[PDB]
Structures are given as structure tokens and as C-alpha cells.
Amino acid sequence: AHAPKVIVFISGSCLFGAISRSLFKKLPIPYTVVLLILGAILGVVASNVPLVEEHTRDVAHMDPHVLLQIFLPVLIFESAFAMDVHTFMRSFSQVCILALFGLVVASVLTAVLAMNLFNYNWNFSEAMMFGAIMSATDPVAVVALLKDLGASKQLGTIIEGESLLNDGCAIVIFNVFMKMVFFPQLTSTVGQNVLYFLQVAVAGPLWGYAVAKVTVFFLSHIFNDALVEITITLAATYLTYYIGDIWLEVSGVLAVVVLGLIVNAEKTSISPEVEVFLHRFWEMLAYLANTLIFMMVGVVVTQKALVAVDKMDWFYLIILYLAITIIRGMVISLFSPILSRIGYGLTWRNAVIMTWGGLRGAVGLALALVVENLAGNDVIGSKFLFHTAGIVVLTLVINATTIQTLLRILGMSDISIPKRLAMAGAVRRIHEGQNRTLNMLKSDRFLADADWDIATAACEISDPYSPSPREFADMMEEARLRMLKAEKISYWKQFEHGMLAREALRLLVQHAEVAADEKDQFILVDDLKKSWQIKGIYPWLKRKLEDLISEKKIAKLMYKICHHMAFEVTINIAIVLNIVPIIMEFVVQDKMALQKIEDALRISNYVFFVIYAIEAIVKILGLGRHYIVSHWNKFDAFILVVALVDIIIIKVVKLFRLLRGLRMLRLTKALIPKLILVVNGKINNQLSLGYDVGKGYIIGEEEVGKIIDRMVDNKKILRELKHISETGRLQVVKELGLLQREHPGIAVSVKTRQAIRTILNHSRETIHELQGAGLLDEMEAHKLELTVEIKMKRLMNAPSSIPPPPPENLLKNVSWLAGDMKLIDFIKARASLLHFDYGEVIVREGDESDGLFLIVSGLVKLYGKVFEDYLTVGNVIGEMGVLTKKPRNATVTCETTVQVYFITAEDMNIAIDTFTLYPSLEYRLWRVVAIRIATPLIMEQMAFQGWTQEKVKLHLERGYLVDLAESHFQFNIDATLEDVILINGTAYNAHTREEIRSPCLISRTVHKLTFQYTATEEPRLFVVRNA
């Protein structure tokens, strides 16, 4: 008889939920309504059949607190965890104005209604509870509908976020007014109310934020332990509510709301495979919670609530339903002028959807169950549940069912022409693909006898949506609209390969859409700047905090110990330990208002004072008279002044603050660096986004500029577009380069994070390629792919700021120098560093090439015959003037203060002729040039296919230069030779004796290349072999 009878009810409710969700899958009525009917049926039979009553009693009569403690954390957290937080923040003010202030008016008006209309003679407190529970909305259905039909970019999240905040605040108001109705306290002190307000409203979010930032800290330090990650998430979610609500008397719901939002924002710290599990897991838990609440409501509403329902109650139900409907619309319209100025605004049709889509749900019902249990035999409990359930039913029966048609009437359900065209094209391409497979299968000997009628009928994919200037402007608009489409595609292809973060993709696509809507409007670079524009607050904080710990002024073993890190670390650790005595002794004294402990801990304070005294002794003997120079030491001398002056002695009570203050304050020296790190983190986030948007736009323009050549007919239009794109690209590449100069360390951090991530991604691909070809066992491959996963998670713990390498390091890591230590020594011992001021010219067109240059600082603009570009740290200039002894091809101007490593041409010839091993210096230098020339050519040839610039760069990377001497002629293999690029010199076609210009992609029709040994120019050829 000790079996947990709650098991059958919980499991049975799951089966009934499955049945309802299955049968009413295509019908309009939401399944939750069916669950309520089933619960009512269970209730009526339970009144007659005692056996079932014994199986429903333990859940139907659930204690009220346990209801809140278990279900609300799931419902609230799941709602928060499922939000599109980025869009939520971009409209946070718009949500808050409507969610918080709108809630107050909506509930109070409802409370006034409930006091005046209803004959229950409720007072204001009960009426406010009524209004609070009536203002909680669960639009899960409406947001789901909008996600498919469109306008989900803003509206779906506004209603979802508004519902989240409204539910969060409703529980707060309900918690406040419940205590004044069922647990009244007479004290009613005016001052305490302010304190009480701060705890529920202000402390809650802070508690949630603290727990969230602790949680994500550990989650980022867990590798390959998915179970631990999931368990940590669960325990953090449940302890946040429990500790906050019970131990701290702090608003649990708000703490969980912040915790859910913060964790959702920090999803990168969760392993990708655990993230997808958690989303489905929390969804499942919320689904279970919803079903239980509806079934419980159905059971109890029939058992003890409908027994005491009068005729007028039904009348008031309809009136109340109408009132809450008009009240929501009035509130939305009343704030409409404000919402127009703050955020995205509200169109009249969008407002109607918000007004009509305000469905009530479980959160409202759960609170009603609490009143029913708490009210006991009072009619308040029954009529609270009656109206809550009734309004829930009506909103589910009417609002939830007609919203689909209303969205059509307002014309919001219409699918745009581009979507229809894309879907039709996709369906047709899939349809064609199946036909190709069908022909292939019919030729198979094994499968030749299959029933093809059934196969074709059962695998069909169906479309679910089924020269005059006056004339000249039409051509312009078509090109503009078509180019904007190519840009949108270009961003998407980048996202698939991981070159672009999702936020940058969304920003770029949104900007493209905004441009398309307006007439004669292209994507505005001056509008893109809002991404990589670092607001001054964070740089100011960084500089100010760095100033506070500028130890440059401070800059026989006592001196050595004074400057050893272990000394400071140990003493700071002692001080943080010394917090415990400080709290303990004074807490004991407060409790005392025995003395044995007090006397004992006063001695320990002397011990800690002695520790600090020996610290000071070491510091002074290390630095001598110059110890007092630093303000920090002055404070640490003042603390020991207090020690000496007050160790001897309101004589007792005055000592606590003196002991506390200085000791607890002198920890800030160890805190300031952490705040510097945090501020770097904030700058690192914004800067990282800036590079993505800027880099994405630059690559998008570069790619599209070679697709628009074939797409637009009118030449004058072609010139027009290629000019705007060039201006925008130069603007971005210049502005983006400057950010590096402003924040060198953070820029290096960002650039290293991308570099590693790109390496690991392609490292992951080869494993799949090896596994895909079967060359590696599945278990062995999975073992390797784990190491990649942990490495990519260690990436997100990398320091936000990395000190930039000194110039000597740059020489080591150059492509055509890395690896050969002897060569690096030769160059490093001959390269001379130079400095330049703003606007100074390093080189000029036609001027004789004197020596190479490597940029170690600053930014330089290039102007050559017209092509213009900007180059920055790490780039090399002067390579094609040394490799071929020819005048310079471009002018170089220093857009800012610049430093360069100058290697004289005379050195290069010596370096070239000295290092002649297989990885020849001249070979590598030419290879670097060749890839830079080849990429534009191959991109131009192959841009109209699915080839992104990264792939072409990788494709060329596999190539190599041909010696061209041991084989004076190059013969064009097709099987193992994919493409051939000429980089220098000229070649003669054997079958035509035609000459081909130096920078050209050898056409496939050429079968053999014949070369010459004239000393004027050594021809150079680049070849990339096939798989």
C-alpha cells in the first residue's frame, strides 16, 4: 500500500495529452481544451467511483506551495530559455513599457471591474489578485503561427517577450497580494515597504544574474561531460528559485527569468550537442507541466467548484471576457504614441494581433489553483477558479481558433512573391532530382522488379504554398533589386561555412531588405558603421582603470620577495580568508545582545594584524624610503596605523567598523585587474561583431562584383553599380583597419580566435572526409573529433586581450620565412626597421624598386593604375619589384603613423642565391604572389557557381609551381591536373603557336604549353592537381 499512486496519474496524463495532441492535430481547436474536458470527465466519475478518487487525490489536492515550487520554475525558465534573446534585447524597452506599465493598468482596471460589476463584494486586495491572475498570457500558439506566416522578425518576439515579462510580474503582484489576504501582517510599517519592494524587484534580478554568471563560468570549464552540463543546468535552475524564494525571501520568478535569459544569451559556453538536448528537454518538461495543470484544473473545477456556481456567474463570465479584451486594446493604443517613438513601433494591424492574441494559459490557472487551495471553503476559491478556467476556455475556443482567419483578413498571412518563387524553384529542382534517381534505380539489376507506381506516388514532393530615360529607370531598378538579392545569397553562403556569425548575417540581411524597400537605395556603409562603432564608455573605463594600477612609478632578497607574485597572492588570500573572522566575531556580538568565543576571536584579529605587520616589514625593507610613494602602500600603512592605535584599547562597539572598513577595502587592488578583464570582454564582443559585419560586407561586395558582370546588360548601369560598391568597400576596409590601431591587444585576440576556429573547422572536415571514404574507423574518427570539440571549447576561454607580438615576431611568422630558422636569422640580422609619419610616401609608381617592406604598424593606402586598396599590419609590399627587377606597380601612402621592416634589394639577391634548398626562398616568394594573382582569376571564372572565396583560396593552396626546366613544356593532363594559371612570362600553344599573356588562366582547350629560356623574364606557372 506504500506505492506512489501519483505515478499512474502523471503517466496517464501523459497518455491523454498524447491522444489529444494526436487527434486534434489538424482541427483548429487547441488540444489543451480537450485536456480540460478529459479532466472534467475524470472529476465527475471520481465523485462516484471511490477507487479513482484514491488515485487522483494526491495530485488533485496538491499542496499550494509545492505547486509553485515545482511547476513555475519549469514554465518560466522554459519560456525564457526559448526566446530569441538578441531580438528580445533589441526591443527590450518596447516590451518593458507595455509589459510592466501595461500590466498595472490592465490589472487595476480589471480589479475595479471585479469590485464594481461582480456582486461578490470583494475588497481591493482580492480584486487585485483577480486582475493579476487574469493578466498572465501564454501566446505559445500565436507566436507559433506567426513564426510560419511571417512578420516574426519583430512581432513574434514582442508578444513572446511581453508575455514572459507579464507572467514574471503577475506572479510578483500575486505573491504580494496573496500575503495581504491569507497571511495578513498588522505591522504595516511605512519604511519597510520600501525595503520589501527592493527585495522582490531589485534583489531578484541581481540574485539571478549572480547565479547565472557563476553557472556559465563552470559550464565553460566542462569538457566532454554532457551529463554534468545538463545536471548543472537543472540544479542551477531549481536552486535559484528555491534559495531565492525561501532562504533569501527574494523574488524567485524574476531570478529564474534573468537566469534563463542570461544562459540563453551565453549558449556558446554550452557544448553544441548538449545545447540541442537542453532545448528539447526543457520543452518536454514544460509540456508535462502544462498537461498536469490542465488536468488538475479539470478535476478540481468539477469536484468542488462547479457545485457552487450561480446563474449570474455565467453572465459575468462573458462581460469579463469582453472587458479584458477591450482593456488590452485600450492599453496598447494608449501607449501606442510612446511605442511609436521607442522601438519598432506598432501598426494598427499588429496592435490588433497583440490584442486578439492574448491567450491565457497554465500560469494563470496555476495561480488560481493556489487560491482555491488557500481559500478553503470560502466561495472566493471556487469563483476565482471558475472565472479563470472560463476565460481560459473562451480564449482557447474563440481567440485561438479565429486568429488564423483574422491574420488572413488583415492580409498578414500572404506569402511574398520572392518566397513563392523560391519555393516553386526548390520544388521543381527536387522533382527533377527524383526523376534522375528513378532512371538510375530502374537500371539496377537488383531493384529492377520494384513496383514503380507505388514508389513514384509515395515519394512525391508537393508545393505547400500552391534607351529612353523613362524606360531607363526600369533597368536601373531591376539591377538594384537583383544585385541586392545576390548580396543576400552571398551572406548566406558565408554562414554555411562558418566564416560569418549568425548575428552579423542577420544584420547584413536586414540592411539589404531595408535597402530594397526604399527607392534608389543601396546598402548604406554609413549605416553599417553602427556595428563596429565602439561606444566611448568602455574605452574610457578601460583607460581609467588601467591608470589606477599604473605601477610605472614604482618601477637584499627583501626587494626580490617584494616583487615576487607569490607574496601579493599569499597576502591577498590571507585577507580574503580574514573576511570570515570579521563577519564571525561581530555576528557573535550581535547574537549576544557566550563571551568566550568573542575573547577567542579578538586574539585571532591580533594574529591577522601581526601577519599584515610582517607583510609591511617585508615591503618596507624591500623598497626602503620609496615604499610610501605608491597610494596603495599609503592605505596599507594607514591600516597598520589603525592596528597599532586600536589594538591596545562605546569603546567596544566603535571597533567593529574600524576593523571592517580598511581590511575589506584593501582588496580592490586584486579586483581592478578583473574589472579590466571584464571591460576587455565587453569591448571584445563588440569589436568581434564589427569585424564580422565589416568582413562579411567586404567579401559580399567582392563576390557580387563578379556576378553582376554577367547579370546587368546596360553598360552605364554596370559602371554605376561597380562604383558604389568600390566606394563602400574602401570605406569599410579603411574604417575597419583603424579599429586595430585603437585597440591593438583586443584586435589581436579577435584575430587569433578566428584563425584557430578556421583551422579546427577544416581539421574537422578532413576527419569526416577520412570517415566518409572509410579510410578511418568510426570509433577512431569519433575519438579524434572529440579532441577537436574540446579544443573549440577551450577557444572561448582564451584571454580577451593578447599583447601584440613585437616586430621581431612578425618576421618569424611570415609565410615565406616560417620554419627555416637559419633563413630567419639571416633576414632578422639584416632587416632594418623604419618609421614614418602621417601622409608620408613610402614608394611611388615607376620609381625604381630598392627593397621589400613588411608592415609592423599602421595603415597604408595604395593607388595604382584605377585600383585602390588599404594594407595593414602583417602585409608585405615590394615583393613583385624584387622578384622581377621592374619598376613599382603602385604608390603607397601612410594613412597613419607607420613602421615597416625594410630589407634592401641587395640582401634579397644574396638571400635568394644562398638559400636554394627544395623549399627555395625564391620558390616560396613566388608562391605567395601566385596565390594572390590567381584568386581573382578563378573567382571571376567560377563566381557564378557555388564557389566561395575561401574555397578558391584553399583550392589554390593545394597547388605548387612547376620548375619548367626539367620539363621545358607543360602538357595539360585532365585527370590529375584540375587548373593551370600563368603568373609570369609568356607561353606558346603547341597546337596553335599562339601567345598567352602572363596573368591569365590557361583555357582548358590548350593541350600543351611551350616555353622559352630568354633571360629577360623567367616564366612562372602555377598548377593545382586533382584529388
Ligand X SMILES: Nc1nc2c(ncn2[C@@H]2O[C@@H]3COP(=O)(O)O[C@H]3[C@H]2O)c(=O)[nH]1
Q: What are the residues binding ligand X (CB under 6 A)? A: 849, 864, 877-881, 888-890, 932
If DSSP codes are grouped into helix, strand and coil, which group holds residue 938? Answer: helix
- Burial group, residue 614, by CB count within 10 angstroms (0-12, 13-18, 19+): exposed
State the nearest-atom distance from the C-beta of 891 to ligand X, in Å.
8
If DSSP codes are grouped into helix, strand and coil, which group holds residue 4? Answer: coil
Q: Which is nearer to ligand X, 731 or 889 (CB)?
A: 889
Rounded CA-CA distance 687/681 in Å is 10
- Burial group, residue 888, by CB count within 10 angstroms (0-12, 13-18, 19+): buried
Backbone phi, psi, residue 853, to 5°: -145, 140
State the nearest-atom distance from the C-beta of 864 to ligand X, in Å.
5
H helices within 773-888, ranges in order? 778-794, 807-813, 821-828, 879-882
Q: Which is nearer to ligand X, 60 or 877 (CB)?
A: 877
State the nearest-atom distance from the C-beta of 1021 to ligand X, in Å.
20
State the nearest-atom distance from the C-beta of 869 to ligand X, in Å.
6
State the nearest-atom distance from the C-beta of 925 to ligand X, in Å.
10
Q: Which is nearer to ligand X, 52 or 928 (CB)?
A: 928
DSSP letter (8 states) at residue 248: S
Place of cell 498572465: 136
371 near 381, Cβ under 8 Å? yes
What letter represents residue 655's amino acid? L
Q: How far is CA 727 from CA 52, 382, 867, in A?
A: 77, 71, 11
State the nearest-atom distance from the C-beta of 912 to ligand X, in Å.
16
State the nearest-atom distance from the C-beta of 932 to ligand X, in Å.
6
State the nearest-atom distance from the C-beta of 621 to ligand X, in Å.
58
36 near 305, Cβ under 8 Å? no
Give me the residues paired with residue 864 across strands. 867
Does an H or E element contain 709, and which? helix 668-711
State the nearest-atom distance from the C-beta of 890 to ligand X, in Å.
4
DSSP 301-324: IIIIIGGG--HHHHHHHHHHHHHH
Sequence ranges of the binding site for a 1,2-diacylglycero-3-phosphate = 2
381 near 387, Cβ under 8 Å? no
Q: Which is nearer to ligand X, 373 or 889 (CB)?
A: 889
Q: Which is nearer to ligand X, 364 or 878 (CB)?
A: 878
Q: Which is nearer to ligand X, 819 or 864 (CB)?
A: 864
Rounded CA-CA distance 289/287 in Å is 5
Contacts of 43 (CB under 8 A, 6+ apart): 298, 299, 300, 301, 302, 303
State the nearest-atom distance from the C-beta of 897 to ligand X, in Å.
20
Q: Which is nearer to ligand X, 633 or 935 (CB)?
A: 935
Q: Which is nearer to ligand X, 742 or 848 (CB)?
A: 848
Does an H or E element contain 80, and which? helix 64-81
Rounded CA-CA distance 375/353 in Å is 36
Rounded CA-CA distance 431/435 in Å is 7
Where on the phi/psi map is residue 224: left (φ > 0), alpha (ψ -120 to 50), or beta? left
Q: Which is nearer to ligand X, 293 or 877 (CB)?
A: 877
State the nearest-atom distance from the C-beta of 734 to ligand X, in Å.
16
Rounded CA-CA distance 590/586 in Å is 6
Rounded CA-CA distance 402/359 in Å is 12
Sequence ranges of the binding site = 2, 878-881, 888-889
Contacts of 892 (CB under 8 A, 6+ apart): 841, 842, 843, 844, 853, 860, 861, 862, 871, 877
If DSSP codes are grouped into helix, strand and coil, which group holds residue 922? Answer: helix
Q: Which is nearer to ligand X, 633 or 889 (CB)?
A: 889
Rounded CA-CA distance 11/531 in Å is 51
- Burial group, residue 232, by CB count within 10 angstroms (0-12, 13-18, 19+): middle
Q: Which is nearer to ligand X, 352 or 877 (CB)?
A: 877
Quick one: how far is CA 981 from the chain centroid? Answer: 41
State the nearest-atom distance from the C-beta of 876 to ligand X, in Å.
6
Q: Which is nearer to ligand X, 270 or 859 (CB)?
A: 859
- Beta carbons within 10 angstroms of residue 267's beta carbon: 17
State the nearest-atom distance from the C-beta of 920 to ligand X, in Å.
19
State the nearest-atom distance from the C-beta of 905 to ligand X, in Å.
11
Rounded CA-CA distance 767/789 in Å is 12
Of how many residues is the chain composed?
A: 1027
- Beta carbons within 10 angstroms of residue 443's beta carbon: 8
Q: Which is nearer to ligand X, 375 or 882 (CB)?
A: 882
Q: Which is nearer to ligand X, 661 or 887 (CB)?
A: 887
Q: Which is nearer to ligand X, 115 or 852 (CB)?
A: 852
720 near 660, Cβ under 8 Å? no
H helices within 269-310, ranges in order? 272-300
State the nearest-atom distance from the C-beta of 999 to ligand X, in Å.
11
State whether the Cα torsion 374-375-376-382 is positive or negative.
negative
Rounded CA-CA distance 780/786 in Å is 10
683 near 539, Cβ under 8 Å? yes
Q: Are strands 867-871 and 987-989 parallel, antiparallel or unpaired?
A: unpaired
